[PDB]
């Protein structure tokens, strides 16, 4: 069933690209991975999950105050924009862009709603990446190669 798993991977990752969850920067990470460093993408995604959860925890606390420190919030969102962009999590990046516009306008409610969306987008791509990475591990353990 390696052949089947490979076809499932193609189809799953294609949905991620078509729906905007991943962009070409995720393919760039793949370019730096090969048989000599076969877990690089996993490692980089893992680092992103650890930093992103810290950022999101600090951000929810910060935005859900009566008066938001927009300067500090904007700097943390900006950091998350960069890190998400760098792994190809384009919908998370775009949510952060939206976020930063509402921070500049100093709109408390829109900041709160936009954080809710950044968090949702982060959890979506985290979950999908875990699924993708789990499938890859299965393919390789079964003796196959990941397509593309």
Tab-separated table of N, CA and C in Angstrom, residues 9 26 29-45 132-133 136-137 140-141 144-146:
chain	number	residue	atom	x	y	z
A	9	UNK	N	-0.635	11.223	-0.443
A	9	UNK	CA	0.238	12.355	-0.159
A	9	UNK	C	0.146	13.406	-1.225
A	26	UNK	N	7.175	26.598	1.288
A	26	UNK	CA	7.247	25.245	1.840
A	26	UNK	C	8.039	24.367	0.892
A	29	UNK	N	11.777	24.812	1.610
A	29	UNK	CA	12.284	24.000	2.727
A	29	UNK	C	12.586	22.623	2.246
A	30	UNK	N	11.708	22.088	1.403
A	30	UNK	CA	11.916	20.758	0.852
A	30	UNK	C	13.205	20.681	0.009
A	31	UNK	N	13.566	21.765	-0.637
A	31	UNK	CA	14.753	21.809	-1.452
A	31	UNK	C	16.001	21.577	-0.617
A	32	UNK	N	15.982	22.020	0.635
A	32	UNK	CA	17.156	21.889	1.538
A	32	UNK	C	17.188	20.555	2.310
A	33	UNK	N	16.222	19.703	2.002
A	33	UNK	CA	16.140	18.363	2.613
A	33	UNK	C	16.424	17.290	1.594
A	34	UNK	N	17.234	16.326	1.975
A	34	UNK	CA	17.502	15.165	1.129
A	34	UNK	C	17.949	14.015	1.975
A	35	UNK	N	18.410	12.951	1.333
A	35	UNK	CA	18.667	11.743	2.096
A	35	UNK	C	19.728	11.935	3.173
A	36	UNK	N	20.569	12.927	3.003
A	36	UNK	CA	21.580	13.238	4.000
A	36	UNK	C	21.061	14.077	5.164
A	37	UNK	N	19.917	14.719	4.981
A	37	UNK	CA	19.259	15.425	6.073
A	37	UNK	C	17.767	15.258	5.891
A	38	UNK	N	17.253	14.081	6.237
A	38	UNK	CA	15.930	13.725	5.779
A	38	UNK	C	14.832	14.232	6.674
A	39	UNK	N	15.207	14.741	7.850
A	39	UNK	CA	14.240	15.275	8.816
A	39	UNK	C	14.272	16.793	8.966
A	40	UNK	N	14.934	17.500	8.047
A	40	UNK	CA	15.017	18.939	8.147
A	40	UNK	C	13.630	19.640	8.190
A	41	UNK	N	12.715	19.280	7.310
A	41	UNK	CA	11.412	19.942	7.270
A	41	UNK	C	10.647	19.735	8.577
A	42	UNK	N	10.626	18.501	9.032
A	42	UNK	CA	10.020	18.192	10.328
A	42	UNK	C	10.601	19.098	11.437
A	43	UNK	N	11.930	19.210	11.464
A	43	UNK	CA	12.576	19.978	12.518
A	43	UNK	C	12.196	21.457	12.467
A	44	UNK	N	12.138	22.002	11.247
A	44	UNK	CA	11.851	23.400	11.075
A	44	UNK	C	10.388	23.656	11.461
A	45	UNK	N	9.478	22.810	10.992
A	45	UNK	CA	8.043	22.932	11.374
A	45	UNK	C	7.893	22.860	12.917
A	132	UNK	N	0.279	15.429	7.237
A	132	UNK	CA	1.211	15.286	6.132
A	132	UNK	C	2.504	14.596	6.579
A	133	UNK	N	3.075	15.083	7.688
A	133	UNK	CA	4.342	14.534	8.216
A	133	UNK	C	4.196	13.080	8.701
A	136	UNK	N	4.153	10.958	5.508
A	136	UNK	CA	5.510	10.831	5.037
A	136	UNK	C	6.281	9.770	5.845
A	137	UNK	N	6.180	9.830	7.170
A	137	UNK	CA	6.882	8.856	7.994
A	137	UNK	C	6.437	7.439	7.653
A	140	UNK	N	7.982	6.325	4.183
A	140	UNK	CA	9.393	6.031	4.240
A	140	UNK	C	9.646	4.771	5.056
A	141	UNK	N	8.872	4.537	6.130
A	141	UNK	CA	9.074	3.336	6.916
A	141	UNK	C	8.724	2.136	6.083
A	144	UNK	N	9.146	3.349	0.793
A	144	UNK	CA	8.922	4.202	-0.346
A	144	UNK	C	9.613	5.525	-0.244
A	145	UNK	N	9.504	6.323	-1.292
A	145	UNK	CA	10.025	7.625	-1.318
A	145	UNK	C	8.848	8.621	-1.359
A	146	UNK	N	9.036	9.807	-0.827
A	146	UNK	CA	8.019	10.814	-0.924
A	146	UNK	C	8.068	11.346	-2.336
